[PDB]
Amino acid sequence: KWVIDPSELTFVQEIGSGQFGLVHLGYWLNKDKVAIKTIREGAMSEEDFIEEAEVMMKLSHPKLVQLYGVCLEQAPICLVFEFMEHGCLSDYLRTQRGLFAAETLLGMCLDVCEGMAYLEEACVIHRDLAARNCLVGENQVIKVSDFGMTRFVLDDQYTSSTGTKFPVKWASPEVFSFSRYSSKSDVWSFGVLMWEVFSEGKIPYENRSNSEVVEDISTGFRLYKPRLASTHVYQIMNHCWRERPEDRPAFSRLLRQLAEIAES
Ligand SMILES: CCOc1ccc2cccc(-n3cc(NC(N)=O)c(C(N)=O)n3)c2c1
């Protein structure tokens, strides 16, 4: 069962503050050290979320951050995850900028790609794949997290394509135009995530407003080649940013292509 009783959790240290509240380093009884995220009431549709728990808790892969269960006895509810010691990918790239070998950066993209190829095979759409949603664990392993979470987020300005805070920077044209989510729209976000990785955590389209990103993309404009991405890597990135989802490679194809580049 996904239900975790409050007595089965101990909060040890405050890791930080997320979007929906607080994040703590804690311990889960007879199991493991965990990351506990407290969710502010009204931030998410808790009822729709718990409905998918039985099926969704079964998803498990070395390249996905495991969400163990939910402590929901009283409000505010808690999400219990595996502990990722180095935090989010975006901050890890930014603070270690200039200390990354190109193979480590490539290796980081490969970790996400394997995670995403597992979700694709399982027919699970992330919807908001970005470096901020990936975590760094022991020995610099990258794991994907927060997949499918935007289907429960209650802020309309983030979820709706015409919303003021819609994450347009990682959106494929069919996503920004119609909210037509697929593993192929995730492939576009993955292409953007690779750019964040090779740029050492720079903000994609930092010099553009939401509407300007939409006009640039529609007119065929793309993110420039990061200094650390080889021409072979930048071509793979561009394949992710193909206007028609059908011309984009699947994560299963990307995994075989990227591994051949890495393995030489
Ligand atoms: C107890 C888990 O319950 C749920 C319920 C609904 C879900 C809907 C979308 C995605 C879910 N989801 C999210 C997960 N992991 C992270 N780090 O986000 C997992 C997992 N199996 O590790 N499942 C869900 C997990």
PDB file of C-alpha atoms and ligand atoms in Angstrom:
ATOM      1  CA  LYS A   1       0.000   0.000   0.000  1.00  0.00           C
ATOM      2  CA  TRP A   2       0.907   3.608  -0.821  1.00  0.00           C
ATOM      3  CA  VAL A   3      -0.639   5.020   2.457  1.00  0.00           C
ATOM      4  CA  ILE A   4       2.101   5.894   4.978  1.00  0.00           C
ATOM      5  CA  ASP A   5       0.900   6.422   8.571  1.00  0.00           C
ATOM      6  CA  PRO A   6       2.337   9.630  10.262  1.00  0.00           C
ATOM      7  CA  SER A   7       3.902   7.395  12.975  1.00  0.00           C
ATOM      8  CA  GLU A   8       5.985   5.656  10.192  1.00  0.00           C
ATOM      9  CA  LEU A   9       7.712   8.971   9.386  1.00  0.00           C
ATOM     10  CA  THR A  10      10.254  11.083  11.266  1.00  0.00           C
ATOM     11  CA  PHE A  11      11.347  14.553  10.031  1.00  0.00           C
ATOM     12  CA  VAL A  12      15.066  15.135  10.684  1.00  0.00           C
ATOM     13  CA  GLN A  13      16.173  18.255   8.776  1.00  0.00           C
ATOM     14  CA  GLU A  14      14.641  20.862   6.469  1.00  0.00           C
ATOM     15  CA  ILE A  15      16.171  20.355   2.944  1.00  0.00           C
ATOM     16  CA  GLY A  16      14.390  23.470   1.626  1.00  0.00           C
ATOM     17  CA  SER A  17      11.202  25.067   0.280  1.00  0.00           C
ATOM     18  CA  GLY A  18       9.546  23.828  -2.899  1.00  0.00           C
ATOM     19  CA  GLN A  19       6.567  25.133  -4.928  1.00  0.00           C
ATOM     20  CA  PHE A  20       3.916  23.427  -2.734  1.00  0.00           C
ATOM     21  CA  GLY A  21       5.558  23.922   0.681  1.00  0.00           C
ATOM     22  CA  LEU A  22       8.509  22.335   2.518  1.00  0.00           C
ATOM     23  CA  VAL A  23      10.994  19.493   1.750  1.00  0.00           C
ATOM     24  CA  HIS A  24      12.572  17.533   4.663  1.00  0.00           C
ATOM     25  CA  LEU A  25      15.227  14.911   4.985  1.00  0.00           C
ATOM     26  CA  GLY A  26      13.630  12.210   7.125  1.00  0.00           C
ATOM     27  CA  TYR A  27      13.453   8.486   7.869  1.00  0.00           C
ATOM     28  CA  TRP A  28      10.690   6.031   6.877  1.00  0.00           C
ATOM     29  CA  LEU A  29      10.112   3.229   9.500  1.00  0.00           C
ATOM     30  CA  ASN A  30      11.848  -0.140   8.783  1.00  0.00           C
ATOM     31  CA  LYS A  31      12.662   1.064   5.229  1.00  0.00           C
ATOM     32  CA  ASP A  32      15.007   3.944   4.377  1.00  0.00           C
ATOM     33  CA  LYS A  33      16.099   7.569   4.637  1.00  0.00           C
ATOM     34  CA  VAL A  34      13.662   9.630   2.552  1.00  0.00           C
ATOM     35  CA  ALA A  35      12.871  13.135   1.179  1.00  0.00           C
ATOM     36  CA  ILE A  36       9.443  14.248   2.480  1.00  0.00           C
ATOM     37  CA  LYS A  37       7.615  16.968   0.557  1.00  0.00           C
ATOM     38  CA  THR A  38       4.780  18.761   2.394  1.00  0.00           C
ATOM     39  CA  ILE A  39       1.948  19.904   0.041  1.00  0.00           C
ATOM     40  CA  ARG A  40       0.002  23.122   0.776  1.00  0.00           C
ATOM     41  CA  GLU A  41      -3.792  22.535   0.582  1.00  0.00           C
ATOM     42  CA  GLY A  42      -5.208  23.824  -2.721  1.00  0.00           C
ATOM     43  CA  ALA A  43      -1.880  23.340  -4.597  1.00  0.00           C
ATOM     44  CA  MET A  44      -3.036  19.985  -6.090  1.00  0.00           C
ATOM     45  CA  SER A  45      -6.090  17.738  -6.728  1.00  0.00           C
ATOM     46  CA  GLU A  46      -5.216  15.264  -3.943  1.00  0.00           C
ATOM     47  CA  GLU A  47      -8.255  13.041  -4.729  1.00  0.00           C
ATOM     48  CA  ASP A  48      -7.370  12.570  -8.454  1.00  0.00           C
ATOM     49  CA  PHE A  49      -3.783  11.938  -7.419  1.00  0.00           C
ATOM     50  CA  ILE A  50      -4.542   9.171  -4.807  1.00  0.00           C
ATOM     51  CA  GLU A  51      -6.786   7.396  -7.427  1.00  0.00           C
ATOM     52  CA  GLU A  52      -3.727   6.648  -9.577  1.00  0.00           C
ATOM     53  CA  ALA A  53      -1.570   5.500  -6.597  1.00  0.00           C
ATOM     54  CA  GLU A  54      -2.200   1.736  -6.889  1.00  0.00           C
ATOM     55  CA  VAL A  55      -1.178   1.608 -10.564  1.00  0.00           C
ATOM     56  CA  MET A  56       1.504   4.380 -10.475  1.00  0.00           C
ATOM     57  CA  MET A  57       3.426   3.202  -7.359  1.00  0.00           C
ATOM     58  CA  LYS A  58       4.350   0.052  -9.413  1.00  0.00           C
ATOM     59  CA  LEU A  59       6.607   2.215 -11.745  1.00  0.00           C
ATOM     60  CA  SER A  60      10.237   1.608 -10.737  1.00  0.00           C
ATOM     61  CA  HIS A  61      13.510   2.053 -12.584  1.00  0.00           C
ATOM     62  CA  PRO A  62      17.099   2.879 -11.487  1.00  0.00           C
ATOM     63  CA  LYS A  63      16.749   6.183 -13.460  1.00  0.00           C
ATOM     64  CA  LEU A  64      13.500   7.436 -11.848  1.00  0.00           C
ATOM     65  CA  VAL A  65      13.196   8.996  -8.353  1.00  0.00           C
ATOM     66  CA  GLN A  66      10.915   6.585  -6.490  1.00  0.00           C
ATOM     67  CA  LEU A  67       7.790   8.079  -4.850  1.00  0.00           C
ATOM     68  CA  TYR A  68       7.129   5.506  -2.055  1.00  0.00           C
ATOM     69  CA  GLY A  69       3.797   6.702  -0.765  1.00  0.00           C
ATOM     70  CA  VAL A  70       1.555   9.419   0.641  1.00  0.00           C
ATOM     71  CA  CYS A  71       1.056  10.441   4.282  1.00  0.00           C
ATOM     72  CA  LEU A  72      -2.464  11.874   4.144  1.00  0.00           C
ATOM     73  CA  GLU A  73      -4.099  11.282   7.627  1.00  0.00           C
ATOM     74  CA  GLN A  74      -4.606  15.093   8.023  1.00  0.00           C
ATOM     75  CA  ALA A  75      -3.797  18.240   5.970  1.00  0.00           C
ATOM     76  CA  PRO A  76      -1.168  19.303   4.818  1.00  0.00           C
ATOM     77  CA  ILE A  77      -0.433  15.951   3.042  1.00  0.00           C
ATOM     78  CA  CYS A  78       3.143  14.531   2.554  1.00  0.00           C
ATOM     79  CA  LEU A  79       4.755  12.891  -0.470  1.00  0.00           C
ATOM     80  CA  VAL A  80       7.527  10.409   0.437  1.00  0.00           C
ATOM     81  CA  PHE A  81      10.387  10.015  -2.091  1.00  0.00           C
ATOM     82  CA  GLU A  82      13.794   8.325  -2.318  1.00  0.00           C
ATOM     83  CA  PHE A  83      16.529  10.709  -1.033  1.00  0.00           C
ATOM     84  CA  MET A  84      18.653  12.351  -3.769  1.00  0.00           C
ATOM     85  CA  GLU A  85      21.769  13.657  -2.019  1.00  0.00           C
ATOM     86  CA  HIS A  86      22.921  16.247  -4.565  1.00  0.00           C
ATOM     87  CA  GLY A  87      19.516  17.918  -5.177  1.00  0.00           C
ATOM     88  CA  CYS A  88      18.090  19.131  -8.510  1.00  0.00           C
ATOM     89  CA  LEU A  89      20.042  18.896 -11.799  1.00  0.00           C
ATOM     90  CA  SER A  90      19.611  22.630 -12.641  1.00  0.00           C
ATOM     91  CA  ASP A  91      21.316  23.895  -9.377  1.00  0.00           C
ATOM     92  CA  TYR A  92      23.984  21.087  -9.595  1.00  0.00           C
ATOM     93  CA  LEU A  93      24.986  22.220 -13.150  1.00  0.00           C
ATOM     94  CA  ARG A  94      25.028  25.955 -12.112  1.00  0.00           C
ATOM     95  CA  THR A  95      27.219  25.491  -8.963  1.00  0.00           C
ATOM     96  CA  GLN A  96      29.665  22.988 -10.660  1.00  0.00           C
ATOM     97  CA  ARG A  97      29.859  25.038 -13.965  1.00  0.00           C
ATOM     98  CA  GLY A  98      33.353  24.760 -15.517  1.00  0.00           C
ATOM     99  CA  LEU A  99      34.133  21.439 -13.702  1.00  0.00           C
ATOM    100  CA  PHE A 100      32.230  19.135 -16.114  1.00  0.00           C
ATOM    101  CA  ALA A 101      33.888  16.842 -18.700  1.00  0.00           C
ATOM    102  CA  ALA A 102      31.782  16.503 -21.885  1.00  0.00           C
ATOM    103  CA  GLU A 103      31.392  12.719 -21.300  1.00  0.00           C
ATOM    104  CA  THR A 104      29.849  13.459 -17.794  1.00  0.00           C
ATOM    105  CA  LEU A 105      27.366  15.882 -19.445  1.00  0.00           C
ATOM    106  CA  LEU A 106      26.576  13.262 -22.122  1.00  0.00           C
ATOM    107  CA  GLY A 107      26.325  10.587 -19.361  1.00  0.00           C
ATOM    108  CA  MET A 108      23.810  12.834 -17.507  1.00  0.00           C
ATOM    109  CA  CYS A 109      21.615  13.027 -20.737  1.00  0.00           C
ATOM    110  CA  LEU A 110      21.879   9.221 -21.109  1.00  0.00           C
ATOM    111  CA  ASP A 111      20.595   8.674 -17.518  1.00  0.00           C
ATOM    112  CA  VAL A 112      17.490  10.846 -18.233  1.00  0.00           C
ATOM    113  CA  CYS A 113      16.976   9.155 -21.634  1.00  0.00           C
ATOM    114  CA  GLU A 114      16.948   5.627 -20.077  1.00  0.00           C
ATOM    115  CA  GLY A 115      14.471   6.920 -17.433  1.00  0.00           C
ATOM    116  CA  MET A 116      12.302   8.454 -20.138  1.00  0.00           C
ATOM    117  CA  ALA A 117      12.499   5.322 -22.414  1.00  0.00           C
ATOM    118  CA  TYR A 118      11.094   3.315 -19.459  1.00  0.00           C
ATOM    119  CA  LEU A 119       8.215   5.854 -19.002  1.00  0.00           C
ATOM    120  CA  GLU A 120       7.574   5.840 -22.786  1.00  0.00           C
ATOM    121  CA  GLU A 121       7.380   1.959 -22.831  1.00  0.00           C
ATOM    122  CA  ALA A 122       5.009   2.216 -19.781  1.00  0.00           C
ATOM    123  CA  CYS A 123       2.924   4.838 -21.745  1.00  0.00           C
ATOM    124  CA  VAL A 124       3.504   7.457 -19.030  1.00  0.00           C
ATOM    125  CA  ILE A 125       3.842  11.069 -20.283  1.00  0.00           C
ATOM    126  CA  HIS A 126       6.007  13.364 -18.070  1.00  0.00           C
ATOM    127  CA  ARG A 127       4.417  16.632 -19.452  1.00  0.00           C
ATOM    128  CA  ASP A 128       7.049  18.947 -17.844  1.00  0.00           C
ATOM    129  CA  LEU A 129      10.503  17.359 -18.351  1.00  0.00           C
ATOM    130  CA  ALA A 130      13.228  19.877 -17.424  1.00  0.00           C
ATOM    131  CA  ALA A 131      16.569  19.970 -15.523  1.00  0.00           C
ATOM    132  CA  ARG A 132      14.643  21.379 -12.428  1.00  0.00           C
ATOM    133  CA  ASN A 133      12.584  18.105 -12.400  1.00  0.00           C
ATOM    134  CA  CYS A 134      15.640  15.829 -12.481  1.00  0.00           C
ATOM    135  CA  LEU A 135      17.680  14.960  -9.415  1.00  0.00           C
ATOM    136  CA  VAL A 136      21.341  14.034  -8.676  1.00  0.00           C
ATOM    137  CA  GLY A 137      22.047  11.101  -6.356  1.00  0.00           C
ATOM    138  CA  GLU A 138      25.044   9.015  -5.346  1.00  0.00           C
ATOM    139  CA  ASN A 139      27.908   8.931  -7.826  1.00  0.00           C
ATOM    140  CA  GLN A 140      26.277  11.720  -9.950  1.00  0.00           C
ATOM    141  CA  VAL A 141      23.433   9.462 -11.179  1.00  0.00           C
ATOM    142  CA  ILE A 142      20.581  11.513 -12.713  1.00  0.00           C
ATOM    143  CA  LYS A 143      17.003  10.425 -12.042  1.00  0.00           C
ATOM    144  CA  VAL A 144      13.760  11.786 -13.505  1.00  0.00           C
ATOM    145  CA  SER A 145      11.056  12.991 -11.047  1.00  0.00           C
ATOM    146  CA  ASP A 146       7.596  14.722 -11.040  1.00  0.00           C
ATOM    147  CA  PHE A 147       6.297  12.885 -14.132  1.00  0.00           C
ATOM    148  CA  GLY A 148       2.570  13.393 -14.802  1.00  0.00           C
ATOM    149  CA  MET A 149       2.325  15.931 -11.886  1.00  0.00           C
ATOM    150  CA  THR A 150       0.869  18.788 -13.983  1.00  0.00           C
ATOM    151  CA  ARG A 151      -2.391  16.724 -14.268  1.00  0.00           C
ATOM    152  CA  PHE A 152      -3.020  17.477 -10.548  1.00  0.00           C
ATOM    153  CA  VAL A 153      -1.518  21.032 -10.258  1.00  0.00           C
ATOM    154  CA  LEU A 154      -4.365  23.511  -9.394  1.00  0.00           C
ATOM    155  CA  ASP A 155      -2.735  26.745 -10.635  1.00  0.00           C
ATOM    156  CA  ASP A 156      -4.419  27.489 -14.028  1.00  0.00           C
ATOM    157  CA  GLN A 157      -1.647  29.921 -15.033  1.00  0.00           C
ATOM    158  CA  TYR A 158       0.882  27.006 -15.094  1.00  0.00           C
ATOM    159  CA  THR A 159      -1.251  24.145 -16.563  1.00  0.00           C
ATOM    160  CA  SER A 160      -3.090  25.997 -19.380  1.00  0.00           C
ATOM    161  CA  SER A 161      -1.062  26.723 -22.594  1.00  0.00           C
ATOM    162  CA  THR A 162      -2.507  30.308 -22.524  1.00  0.00           C
ATOM    163  CA  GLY A 163      -1.505  30.638 -18.814  1.00  0.00           C
ATOM    164  CA  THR A 164       0.876  33.430 -17.689  1.00  0.00           C
ATOM    165  CA  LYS A 165       3.365  30.891 -16.072  1.00  0.00           C
ATOM    166  CA  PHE A 166       2.978  27.997 -18.679  1.00  0.00           C
ATOM    167  CA  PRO A 167       6.466  26.368 -19.026  1.00  0.00           C
ATOM    168  CA  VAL A 168       6.601  27.298 -22.787  1.00  0.00           C
ATOM    169  CA  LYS A 169      10.488  26.927 -22.896  1.00  0.00           C
ATOM    170  CA  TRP A 170      10.157  23.078 -22.744  1.00  0.00           C
ATOM    171  CA  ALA A 171       6.939  22.901 -24.848  1.00  0.00           C
ATOM    172  CA  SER A 172       6.656  21.396 -28.310  1.00  0.00           C
ATOM    173  CA  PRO A 173       4.472  23.423 -30.752  1.00  0.00           C
ATOM    174  CA  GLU A 174       1.550  20.958 -30.415  1.00  0.00           C
ATOM    175  CA  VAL A 175       1.839  21.325 -26.580  1.00  0.00           C
ATOM    176  CA  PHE A 176       1.925  25.192 -26.602  1.00  0.00           C
ATOM    177  CA  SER A 177      -0.877  25.247 -29.222  1.00  0.00           C
ATOM    178  CA  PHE A 178      -3.186  22.390 -28.160  1.00  0.00           C
ATOM    179  CA  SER A 179      -1.963  20.693 -24.894  1.00  0.00           C
ATOM    180  CA  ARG A 180      -1.499  17.601 -27.123  1.00  0.00           C
ATOM    181  CA  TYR A 181       0.789  15.654 -24.788  1.00  0.00           C
ATOM    182  CA  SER A 182       2.716  12.511 -25.852  1.00  0.00           C
ATOM    183  CA  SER A 183       6.116  10.802 -25.343  1.00  0.00           C
ATOM    184  CA  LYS A 184       6.985  12.761 -28.583  1.00  0.00           C
ATOM    185  CA  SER A 185       6.191  16.100 -26.873  1.00  0.00           C
ATOM    186  CA  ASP A 186       8.356  14.821 -23.944  1.00  0.00           C
ATOM    187  CA  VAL A 187      11.113  14.157 -26.640  1.00  0.00           C
ATOM    188  CA  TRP A 188      11.013  17.937 -27.448  1.00  0.00           C
ATOM    189  CA  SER A 189      11.346  18.775 -23.671  1.00  0.00           C
ATOM    190  CA  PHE A 190      14.200  16.231 -23.528  1.00  0.00           C
ATOM    191  CA  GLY A 191      15.958  18.110 -26.374  1.00  0.00           C
ATOM    192  CA  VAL A 192      15.649  21.341 -24.287  1.00  0.00           C
ATOM    193  CA  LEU A 193      16.835  19.415 -21.143  1.00  0.00           C
ATOM    194  CA  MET A 194      19.999  18.268 -23.134  1.00  0.00           C
ATOM    195  CA  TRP A 195      20.680  21.973 -23.992  1.00  0.00           C
ATOM    196  CA  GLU A 196      20.359  22.900 -20.232  1.00  0.00           C
ATOM    197  CA  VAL A 197      22.855  20.100 -19.510  1.00  0.00           C
ATOM    198  CA  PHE A 198      25.531  20.979 -22.158  1.00  0.00           C
ATOM    199  CA  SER A 199      25.147  24.794 -21.329  1.00  0.00           C
ATOM    200  CA  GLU A 200      25.889  23.943 -17.665  1.00  0.00           C
ATOM    201  CA  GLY A 201      22.470  25.030 -16.407  1.00  0.00           C
ATOM    202  CA  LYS A 202      21.788  28.174 -18.446  1.00  0.00           C
ATOM    203  CA  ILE A 203      18.114  29.264 -18.865  1.00  0.00           C
ATOM    204  CA  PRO A 204      16.805  28.338 -22.367  1.00  0.00           C
ATOM    205  CA  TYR A 205      15.471  31.408 -24.294  1.00  0.00           C
ATOM    206  CA  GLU A 206      16.379  33.683 -21.286  1.00  0.00           C
ATOM    207  CA  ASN A 207      16.287  36.731 -23.635  1.00  0.00           C
ATOM    208  CA  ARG A 208      12.682  36.003 -24.819  1.00  0.00           C
ATOM    209  CA  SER A 209       9.125  36.365 -23.404  1.00  0.00           C
ATOM    210  CA  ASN A 210       6.630  33.421 -23.613  1.00  0.00           C
ATOM    211  CA  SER A 211       4.963  34.781 -26.775  1.00  0.00           C
ATOM    212  CA  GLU A 212       8.388  35.534 -28.434  1.00  0.00           C
ATOM    213  CA  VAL A 213       9.489  31.870 -27.733  1.00  0.00           C
ATOM    214  CA  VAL A 214       6.234  30.712 -29.486  1.00  0.00           C
ATOM    215  CA  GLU A 215       6.862  32.992 -32.516  1.00  0.00           C
ATOM    216  CA  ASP A 216      10.615  32.037 -32.764  1.00  0.00           C
ATOM    217  CA  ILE A 217       9.827  28.275 -32.631  1.00  0.00           C
ATOM    218  CA  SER A 218       6.915  28.569 -35.153  1.00  0.00           C
ATOM    219  CA  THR A 219       9.213  30.436 -37.572  1.00  0.00           C
ATOM    220  CA  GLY A 220      11.869  27.663 -37.299  1.00  0.00           C
ATOM    221  CA  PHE A 221      14.210  29.265 -34.743  1.00  0.00           C
ATOM    222  CA  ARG A 222      16.070  26.980 -32.313  1.00  0.00           C
ATOM    223  CA  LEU A 223      18.459  27.069 -29.342  1.00  0.00           C
ATOM    224  CA  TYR A 224      22.145  27.705 -30.375  1.00  0.00           C
ATOM    225  CA  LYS A 225      24.907  25.032 -30.088  1.00  0.00           C
ATOM    226  CA  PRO A 226      26.301  24.898 -26.484  1.00  0.00           C
ATOM    227  CA  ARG A 227      30.179  25.083 -26.507  1.00  0.00           C
ATOM    228  CA  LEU A 228      30.352  21.580 -24.873  1.00  0.00           C
ATOM    229  CA  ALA A 229      27.924  19.792 -27.215  1.00  0.00           C
ATOM    230  CA  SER A 230      29.705  18.114 -30.174  1.00  0.00           C
ATOM    231  CA  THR A 231      28.120  18.484 -33.667  1.00  0.00           C
ATOM    232  CA  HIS A 232      26.777  14.875 -33.312  1.00  0.00           C
ATOM    233  CA  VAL A 233      25.088  15.787 -29.945  1.00  0.00           C
ATOM    234  CA  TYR A 234      23.633  19.081 -31.342  1.00  0.00           C
ATOM    235  CA  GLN A 235      22.105  17.116 -34.320  1.00  0.00           C
ATOM    236  CA  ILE A 236      20.407  14.714 -31.809  1.00  0.00           C
ATOM    237  CA  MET A 237      19.113  17.877 -29.962  1.00  0.00           C
ATOM    238  CA  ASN A 238      17.735  19.253 -33.278  1.00  0.00           C
ATOM    239  CA  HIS A 239      16.013  15.914 -34.025  1.00  0.00           C
ATOM    240  CA  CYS A 240      14.116  16.460 -30.718  1.00  0.00           C
ATOM    241  CA  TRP A 241      13.000  19.906 -31.982  1.00  0.00           C
ATOM    242  CA  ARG A 242      11.325  18.757 -35.152  1.00  0.00           C
ATOM    243  CA  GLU A 243       8.040  20.584 -35.711  1.00  0.00           C
ATOM    244  CA  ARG A 244       5.970  17.379 -36.405  1.00  0.00           C
ATOM    245  CA  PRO A 245       5.985  14.972 -33.388  1.00  0.00           C
ATOM    246  CA  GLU A 246       6.066  11.983 -35.882  1.00  0.00           C
ATOM    247  CA  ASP A 247       9.498  13.159 -37.287  1.00  0.00           C
ATOM    248  CA  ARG A 248      10.957  13.223 -33.728  1.00  0.00           C
ATOM    249  CA  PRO A 249      12.874  10.066 -32.640  1.00  0.00           C
ATOM    250  CA  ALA A 250      11.315   7.943 -29.860  1.00  0.00           C
ATOM    251  CA  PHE A 251      13.224   7.805 -26.516  1.00  0.00           C
ATOM    252  CA  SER A 252      14.003   4.125 -27.403  1.00  0.00           C
ATOM    253  CA  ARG A 253      15.701   5.335 -30.649  1.00  0.00           C
ATOM    254  CA  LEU A 254      17.425   8.297 -28.848  1.00  0.00           C
ATOM    255  CA  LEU A 255      18.780   5.854 -26.208  1.00  0.00           C
ATOM    256  CA  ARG A 256      20.460   3.649 -28.866  1.00  0.00           C
ATOM    257  CA  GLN A 257      21.748   6.762 -30.777  1.00  0.00           C
ATOM    258  CA  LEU A 258      23.163   8.613 -27.722  1.00  0.00           C
ATOM    259  CA  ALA A 259      24.743   5.394 -26.300  1.00  0.00           C
ATOM    260  CA  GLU A 260      26.567   4.795 -29.649  1.00  0.00           C
ATOM    261  CA  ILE A 261      28.010   8.369 -29.476  1.00  0.00           C
ATOM    262  CA  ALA A 262      29.097   7.903 -25.792  1.00  0.00           C
ATOM    263  CA  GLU A 263      30.471   4.313 -26.133  1.00  0.00           C
ATOM    264  CA  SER A 264      32.333   5.751 -29.218  1.00  0.00           C
TER     265      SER A 264
HETATM  266  C1  LIG B   1       2.215   6.497  -4.183  1.00  0.00           C
HETATM  267  C2  LIG B   1       2.425   7.004  -5.604  1.00  0.00           C
HETATM  268  O1  LIG B   1       1.158   7.491  -6.015  1.00  0.00           O
HETATM  269  C3  LIG B   1       1.097   8.119  -7.221  1.00  0.00           C
HETATM  270  C4  LIG B   1      -0.221   8.544  -7.566  1.00  0.00           C
HETATM  271  C5  LIG B   1      -0.414   9.199  -8.745  1.00  0.00           C
HETATM  272  C6  LIG B   1       0.676   9.470  -9.619  1.00  0.00           C
HETATM  273  C7  LIG B   1       0.468  10.171 -10.834  1.00  0.00           C
HETATM  274  C8  LIG B   1       1.522  10.501 -11.639  1.00  0.00           C
HETATM  275  C9  LIG B   1       2.835  10.114 -11.291  1.00  0.00           C
HETATM  276  C10 LIG B   1       3.037   9.402 -10.136  1.00  0.00           C
HETATM  277  N1  LIG B   1       4.379   9.010  -9.808  1.00  0.00           N
HETATM  278  C11 LIG B   1       5.442   9.894  -9.578  1.00  0.00           C
HETATM  279  C12 LIG B   1       6.515   9.078  -9.202  1.00  0.00           C
HETATM  280  N2  LIG B   1       7.817   9.407  -8.839  1.00  0.00           N
HETATM  281  C13 LIG B   1       8.246  10.742  -8.785  1.00  0.00           C
HETATM  282  N3  LIG B   1       9.528  10.954  -8.293  1.00  0.00           N
HETATM  283  O2  LIG B   1       7.544  11.690  -9.151  1.00  0.00           O
HETATM  284  C14 LIG B   1       6.022   7.730  -9.244  1.00  0.00           C
HETATM  285  C15 LIG B   1       6.779   6.523  -8.913  1.00  0.00           C
HETATM  286  N4  LIG B   1       6.165   5.310  -9.109  1.00  0.00           N
HETATM  287  O3  LIG B   1       7.930   6.581  -8.466  1.00  0.00           O
HETATM  288  N5  LIG B   1       4.706   7.716  -9.624  1.00  0.00           N
HETATM  289  C16 LIG B   1       1.968   9.059  -9.255  1.00  0.00           C
HETATM  290  C17 LIG B   1       2.170   8.365  -8.038  1.00  0.00           C
END
